[PDB]
C-alpha cells in the first residue's frame, strides 16, 4: 500500500493511494463507502470522480468494482486493481485511518542500493524518500576497479542492489560479485538501463524496478508463511487448514494468522459471507493473509485445501 498523498483537516480530506497486494485491495474494498468520492483514471484516459453509490469484487477477477455518479472530471464505473492508483476523498473514520497505518507496515521496503557501472566508472546512490542519495563514485589486463566497488557498496550496508550502466561492465560485475561476494549477489540484479549516474537512478525508477523488489519482498514471505504452516503440519501443533478445521479454530478465535488463497475467496464468496470471516480474525488482532494462486505460495495453499490458519494454541482436544 502506498501512499501518495494526503490532505487531511478535521479528519475529512482526500487520500491519494495506490494498493501493492491483494491485502490491499481487499481493505480499500471495506475502506471506500457508499457516499465517499473515489477519483480514478479510466476511459485516452481521463480520470473522473464519481460518488460511490456500489462497491464490489470482480467475480471472475482480482479486481474492485466501485460505481456511481460522476461527481467530477451520468454514471460510471471504476475497477480497481493492484498497481492502480485512486483518490478515496470523505470524512475518515479512526479504524479505516489505523488500518491504512497498517497496510503502510506491511509494504516496507527494503534498503535499496542502486549501482551504474561503465567501464573505469561507478556510481552508487541509496534510495530515499526525495529520491536517489548518491554514496559514493569510483573511477578506474587488470581491472580490480570491481573489487574496489565491491568493497564499498559491502560497507555501505544495504539488502538489495539494482546493478545498471552501459554495455556488459554490469554483467561482469555482477559475475564478480557471484564469485567473490555470493552474499551481496544473490540480492542483486542487472537491469537493462544504458544511462549511468543521475540519468540512470532516474530511468530506474521510472522502470519500477523497485516495484518488483517489493514484489518479490512479498511473495518470499507467503512462502515464509506456507513454511510455517508446514513445519507446523509436521509438528502436528497450532494449525489448521480446510475450511472446516479453520473455522472450528475460529469459534475459539485461536487465530493469530489466517492465510487464503484468492481462488478461494472468489469461489466462496458466491455461497456465503467469506468475508466476514476475514473481518472476525482481524477484529480479533489477527493478520490476514491474500496470496494469489498466480504464484507458487498460493497453489501450495490451495492444494491444502484454499484456507488455513497459524494458531495461538491448539484447539482439537
Keep these: 500500500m502506498q501512499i501518495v498523498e494526503e490532505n487531511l483537516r478535521d479528519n475529512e480530506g482526500e487520500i491519494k493511494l495506490i494498493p501493492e497486494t491483494l491485502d490491499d485491495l481487499w481493505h480499500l474494498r471495506f475502506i471506500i463507502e457508499k457516499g465517499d468520492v473515489v477519483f480514478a483514471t479510466t476511459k485516452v484516459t481521463v480520470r473522473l470522480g464519481i460518488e460511490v453509490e456500489k462497491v464490489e469484487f470482480h467475480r471472475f477477477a482480482n479486481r474492485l468494482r466501485v460505481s456511481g455518479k460522476i461527481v467530477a472530471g451520468g454514471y460510471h464505473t471504476l475497477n480497481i486493481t493492484v498497481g492502480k492508483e485512486l483518490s478515496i476523498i470523505k470524512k475518515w473514520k479512526p479504524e479505516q485511518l489505523e488500518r491504512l497505518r497498517r497496510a503502510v507496515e506491511d509494504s516496507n521496503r527494503p534498503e535499496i542500493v542502486m549501482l551504474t557501472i561503465e567501464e573505469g566508472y561507478a556510481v552508487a546512490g541509496v534510495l530515499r524518500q526525495w529520491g536517489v542519495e548518491e554514496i559514493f563514485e569510483e573511477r578506474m589486463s587488470r581491472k580490480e576497479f570491481f573489487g574496489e566497488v565491491a568493497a564499498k557498496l559491502e560497507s555501505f550496508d544495504f539488502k538489495?542492489?539494482?546493478?545498471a550502466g552501459p554495455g556488459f561492465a554490469k554483467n561482469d560485475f555482477l559475475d564478480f560479485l557471484?564469485?567473490?561476494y555470493p552474499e551481496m549477489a544473490k540480492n542483486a540484479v542487472v537491469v537493462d538501463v544504458s544511462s549511468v549516474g543521475s540519468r540512470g537512478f532516474i530511468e530506474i525508477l521510472k522502470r519500477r524496478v523497485v516495484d518488483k523488489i517489493v514484489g518479490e519482498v512479498r511473495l518470499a514471505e507467503e512462502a515464509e508463511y506456507i513454511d510455517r504452516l508446514l513445519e507446523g503440519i509436521a509438528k502436528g501443533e497450532r494449525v489448521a487448514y480446510g475450511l472446516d478445521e479453520v473455522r472450528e479454530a475460529h469459534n475459539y478465535?485461536?487465530?493469530?494468522?489466517?492465510?487464503?488463497?484468492?481462488?478461494?475467496?472468489?469461489?466462496?464468496?458466491?455461497?456465503?459471507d467469506v468475508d466476514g470471516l476475514l473481518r472476525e480474525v482481524e477484529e480479533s488482532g489477527g493478520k490476514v493473509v491474500i496470496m494469489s494462486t498466480e504464484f507458487?505460495?498460493?497453489?501450495?495453499?490451495?492444494?491444502?485445501?484454499?484456507?488455513?490458519?497459524?494458531?495461538?494454541?491448539?484447539?482439537?482436544?
Design 160 to 163: 538489495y542492489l539494482i546493478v
Design 178 to 180: 557471484k564469485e567473490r
Design 253 to 272: 478465535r485461536a487465530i493469530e494468522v489466517l492465510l487464503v488463497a484468492d481462488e478461494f475467496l472468489l469461489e466462496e464468496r458466491e455461497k456465503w
Design 296 to 317: 507458487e505460495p498460493g497453489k501450495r495453499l490451495m492444494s491444502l485445501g484454499g484456507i488455513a490458519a497459524l494458531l495461538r494454541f491448539n484447539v482439537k482436544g
